[PDB]
């Protein structure tokens, strides 16, 4: 009656079509890969790289299990190409593509029946191409259980992975070049050139290229590595704005002596399309604090102890008994922030006494109203909610930073525009971009629409003074490919969604800023 | 009131005073760029000679002959003055301003033929003991500004040189150059328009508004000559021109209940410089500024009764202040033209309770503008100086929601910048008006806080173009932006709410003629 009841489309909105994936390959100086059924040359170093890459998980502590393991997708012939001894490849879910052999078939070509069972959960075949496997890898069984998918083989499987619709899901390309002149290979491996029609908009760029190496296999084979990634313009916006602030910003100093370089006015754009979640990659974002807090906003919650009992401490300092009293909010119990954010969203202007009191029905529920208009007249131009309430500011532990947001609908996709008066580029902005990408996605699921874009308007954009060096280290990193957001399960009411219902997948941030 | 009102600081006139008046430059060169061999113009071409005359004499909007209360003015070095045949001196229909460190206004006068001539041209001849810069400075005075419509630098190698370099170059609205095929006339002084990207161009990008075909003069030798009107590329206005264009070519088409169709995109942001009395009044389509100025002053005063606008010849609220529209919103209790707690009421009484427009609201609600003003003056780095009119509570009580619902002020180097947030932006008639409103407010708020105007950042939400406006907003696209005009205050006030539309005037606004489609 007070809560927003999710529609019967709820899940159909964000259903993950195809699981993203990386690609591993070896090529000779001529771009050749091999001829039909063999890789004539053999470089132990490359072999090891393959073993480690495709098998290890990022969590430098966990060993592959049927709960968390990487997956390897390959074409039949390539499977045939594996020494019946090394098959299936250990520690990885082996996905063979073939319109003949079946899960039981591949399995029976294996010697010792001991493994013909120990490798029953390790082998699976699909009667289709990479797309269908990427599609079968997107189901609840495999996602998020399978951490990373590696398309390991087949000039035929490669061709598909390098062309739409698959390429749009290609997170990275690892390419070892074995400088061992050989004509064995017939099929050449080509990464689509930038700007051409085969690149379907994707700009492949090298993230890392090694120096010429020589394998210790008594052949002095010359080889080297390459990790190519799809240029992420989006994350660049962020990095550009930052680098500009540092370089040309205005250095202002607090009354507490805090330094900030800043510029006024700026706008960035992000695509929430096809399960894409814009979590920066140049510095890991605390997604859980985002989800737990956003969810907290949606419920009009005002009690910070709730995020606190959940590990999210973003409101501790402004919820201290000291702080609260320094605001004259002496009657507020510690951690009772007042009518901040979510409260104004769901109850604009309602009288606030304590976080205990029931507020159902109270005030103006801007969100319940945005949900209802979106579903009846999506072309309306007044679908925006605000927490910036001049009258209630004094009763708030603090004035809101992200104080306004408007929605827009076109061709069934919901877009959102956020207005942030003040934003810290070091920790706030990345966090907030997350917050509103998550808010827009839910609001869509709740309105029978499909996520579109998130437009971020910054007012006072500033890099704190002692972030300059770190933010410089980060500015060095090349942005990678954004992760994706899936939903394990749904809820009947928006207000009932928990952080354990959505899983972030394929998020591969760089290491902590080595400071 | 008084304490209710916003008192303007002493420096109220210090940050808006106009230093250098804007001007155009008219000159003639030979195929090699020579103006003359510092002795004379070795070539006189009839057709051009007429162009110079009409160009520097005529005023905007024909059927208006010059007068002492409204005339153009020409600036020239003493020699060039000397080179005008004493008889046709001074150029008639224009304020003849002469640069000379040896001649005084009186001396120039003594140079005319007789006392009669000296008494008829008293107020048409003035001497400035300085350069073009001092002439533009003097012209910037209340005596000649806005009195003098257009200043034309008519000549002098010495003057062109000054005219084409900082600081004066930043006030060169346009260059009118005539190229004549002067045979063997190997003069000495060269007139060269700084190229794009070079240091000398000082960041300006001179482009041709117009150029004429090679023309043949019906004089004696048939000397061939041509015309050029160079102007300083205005990226700022192209901002809007690009977005409009992107909307027509790529926007999404939509038709609401009324059946009114529009194309549109979502999310945009432009920037406009308000430094040095600059006013971002769009030039490819005349903006109704009298209305803009009236309504902004209406907004700041905290008004809600549309009538005060229609009594001043402004009807931008007639449709939404009517009897039917009012009722159609359930506002039956409201008198006709009483829009309710709209815009300014929230600006000066956020949250206050409304009854009627003639009610007394002093001390009621939060006076946001009054607060931003006091903070700008004491803690200009505060990251919370923004007023809002998007108040969900009173929304149902207004004649309709605000389109420009949020503004935020920023300070840097004593320059007040202002960002605006607009949910519904009508690119054809709406956007240009709003860019003027928030340009005016920023200027006014800067004045009220001892600050110099900075930039205006405009954030667009739902930016559209009506289908009815598509063809014309396409003709306009053709038009190449011209330099923006300026804003000068002819008087000041004790309080911010006291300013009337007449206390200020836009000068040097040269908008392209109305569009050729009814
Ligand atoms: N040097 C290196 O780094 C690498 C070398 N290689 C070499 O490449 C060669 C393999 O390449 P290639 O001949 O292209 O073979 P693949 O290994 O790609 O296998 C192709 C086979 O996979 C199946 N398949 C592919 N697409 C589909 C589809 N859309 N639907 C159903 N089944 C499909 C078919 O099996 P079926 O016909 O049974 O139905 C098909 O004939 C080998 O010699 C291998 O050693 C491979 C990877 C890396
Ligand atoms: N083809 C064309 O379109 C044009 C051709 N001409 C030709 O150019 C020649 C004139 O050029 P030029 O010799 O450069 O003369 P100018 O016409 O520029 O006159 C120079 C004089 O102007 C005054 N002046 C300039 N700058 C200053 C300053 N900063 N402070 C004080 N006084 C200043 C001085 O007066 P004072 O002497 O009292 O110190 C000075 O000597 C003429 O032969 C004229 O016919 C001129 C205009 C246009
Ligand atoms: N950079 C890279 N990528 C591969 N994808 C690869 C490979 O892939 C072919 C799939 C068959 O895998 C094996 C695994 C172990 C032994 C073997 F002979 C084949 C085989 C050898 C080197 C390789 N090197
Ligand atoms: N394209 C162009 N530009 C000028 N700037 C110009 C001019 O400049 C005016 C300065 C000197 O003015 C006179 C006016 C009348 C007679 C005379 F000899 C000089 C005079 C005549 C033609 C001109 N033509």
UniProtKB/Swiss-Prot annotation, chain A:
The keyword Manganese does not apply. Residues 235-515 are annotated as: Thymidylate synthase. SUPFAM superfamilies: Dihydrofolate reductase-like, Thymidylate synthase/dCMP hydroxymethylase. Keywords: Methyltransferase, Multifunctional enzyme, NADP, Nucleotide biosynthesis, One-carbon metabolism, Oxidoreductase, Transferase. The keyword Methyltransferase applies. It holds the Pfam family Thymidylat_synt. One of its GO terms (biological process) is dTMP biosynthetic process. The active site is at residue 401. InterPro entries: DHFR-like_dom_sf, DHFR-TS, DHFR_CS, DHFR_dom, Thymidate_synth/dCMP_Mease, Thymidate_synth/dCMP_Mease_dom, Thymidate_synth/dCMP_Mease_sf, Thymidylate_synthase. Pathway: Cofactor biosynthesis; tetrahydrofolate biosynthesis; 5,6,7,8-tetrahydrofolate from 7,8-dihydrofolate: step 1/1. DUMP binds at residues 255, 402, 420-424, 432, 462-464. Its EC number is 1.5.1.3, 2.1.1.45. Homodimer. Bifunctional enzyme. Involved in de novo dTMP biosynthesis. Key enzyme in folate metabolism. Catalyzes an essential reaction for de novo glycine and purine synthesis, DNA precursor synthesis, and for the conversion of dUMP to dTMP. This is Bifunctional dihydrofolate reductase-thymidylate synthase. It comes from Trypanosoma cruzi. The lineage of its organism: Eukaryota, Discoba, Euglenozoa, Kinetoplastea, Metakinetoplastina.
